[PDB]
Amino acid sequence: PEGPELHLASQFVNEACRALVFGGCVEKSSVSRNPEVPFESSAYRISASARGKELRLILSPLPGAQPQQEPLALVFRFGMSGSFQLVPREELPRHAHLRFYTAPPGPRLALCFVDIRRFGRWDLGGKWQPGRGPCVLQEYQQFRENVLRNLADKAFDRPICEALLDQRFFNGIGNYLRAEILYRLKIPPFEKARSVLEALQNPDLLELCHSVPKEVVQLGGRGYGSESPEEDFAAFRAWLRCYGMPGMSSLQDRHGRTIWFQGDPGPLAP
DNA sequence: CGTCCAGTCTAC
DNA sequence: TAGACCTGGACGG
């Protein structure tokens, strides 16, 4: 998942938990190498916000809750397969590595961090990853300024397709967005990043870094819609113009990740 | 049955 | 920079 999936995951947590009350401990699977969450409360509400490719949960005990406890924040990174689900308490999915449990009265549910491949991570601080840049979706102007003031960075020496995955400058862009973004402007992927960016200093590359992900968010779905996984998966394939599509070229960047593009590979190509 | 394919993080 | 971390689905024999 990329910035749009993290954003939709946070909206899912806010809408699904709006009328729920959690109680008890936060339970971690025995196979997860992530930290135990030291939190217990007889009555707490869960809420969420996204920033780039990170999501922050806030656990908020109600007035009167026991034990006495301040709100607790956790920050998640989803890696390749992270997600959130709200399921019946006895119908936990196979890779539910972190679990929050509704309290009575009402149907006993669990909000679960589900992560098949366990590349995802959580941290006890409620702090965003030091060094990640501002959110291309929610901090557009900060995102733009942070790129254009730092074009000197050796990061922008690299091909534009590699620069676009550097989460210090493009927090929330991943493999499918970089393909989709470059294709809208027909910018060869192995053009030099500083060349393409010096040139701004008819939307431009940094505008699309915001507006293209924003399209996926408006689309909805990505496992957080009411509609089926069949309907979701199709809606998304239909939106895609470049990533994975018939008629499109693909190469490996310096990190063995696949870039999709039409036409000129660009000067710095393998 | 087998190979191959799909975001960080860290040891060299 | 390679290799490491993981599981599962698609496809080949």
The residues that bridge with A46 in the sheet, in sequence order, are: A59
- A127 is an active site residue: no
A76 within 8 A of A57, measured Cβ to Cβ:
yes
Same domain for A82 and A156? no
- The domain tally of chain A equals 2
- Alpha-carbon A72 to chain mean position: 21
Same domain for A13 and A97? yes
On whether residue A267 sits in a domain, the answer given is no
> Which strand C bases fall within 7 angstroms of a protein CB?
1-3, 5-8
Matching residue, tokens 């996984």: A229
- Distance between CA atoms of residues A234 and A222, nearest Å: 10
Q: Determine the distance between A118 (CA) and B11 (C1') in angstroms.
A: 20
Same domain for A126 and A176? no
Same domain for A78 and A120? yes
Report CA-CA distances (Å) from A208 to A74, A137, A188, A253.
30, 10, 15, 21
A82 within 8 A of A76, measured Cβ to Cβ:
yes
| Domain-ending residue, one of A132, A165, A183 | A132
| Domain-ending residue, one of A132, A149, A173 | A132
Structure-determination approach: X-ray
Q: Determine the distance between A255 (CA) and B3 (C1') in angstroms.
A: 21
- A230 is an active site residue: no
A214 within 8 A of A143, measured Cβ to Cβ:
no
On whether residue A87 sits in a domain, the answer given is yes
Same domain for A93 and A117? yes
Tokens of A112: 């679960």
Residue-number span of the structural domain to which A209 is assigned:
133-262
Same domain for A86 and A185? no
Q: Which nucleotide has its C1' atom closest to residue A94's CA? A: C7
Q: What is the 3-state secondary structure (H, E, C) of chain A?
A: CCHHHHHHHHHHHHHHCCCCCEEEECEECCCCCCCCCCCEEEEEEEEEEEECCEEEEEEEECCCCCCCCCCEEEEEECCCCEEEEEEECCCCCCCEEEEEEECCCCCCEEEEEEECCCCCEEECCCCCCCCCCCCCCCCHHHHHHHHHCCCCCHHHHCEHHHHCCCCCCCCCCCHHHHHHHHHHHCCCCCCEHHHHHHCCCCCCHHHHHHHHHHHHHHHCCCCCCCCCHHHHHHHHHHHCCCCCCCCCEEEECCCCCEEEECCCCCCCCC
Same domain for A114 and A139? no
Q: Would the annotation count A175 as a binding residue?
A: yes
Tokens of A128: 């965003």
On whether residue A269 sits in a domain, the answer given is no
On whether residue A268 sits in a domain, the answer given is no
Matching residue, tokens 């009575």: A104
Same domain for A89 and A139? no
A232: Cα within 13 Å, side-chain hemisphere: 13
Angle between helices A205-219 and A140-148 (to 10 degrees): 150
Same domain for A159 and A102? no
* Total Cβ atoms within 10 A of residue A56: 18
A250 within 8 A of A143, measured Cβ to Cβ:
no
Same domain for A31 and A117? yes
- Distance between CA atoms of residues A148 and A200, nearest Å: 9
Tokens of A180: 């989709």
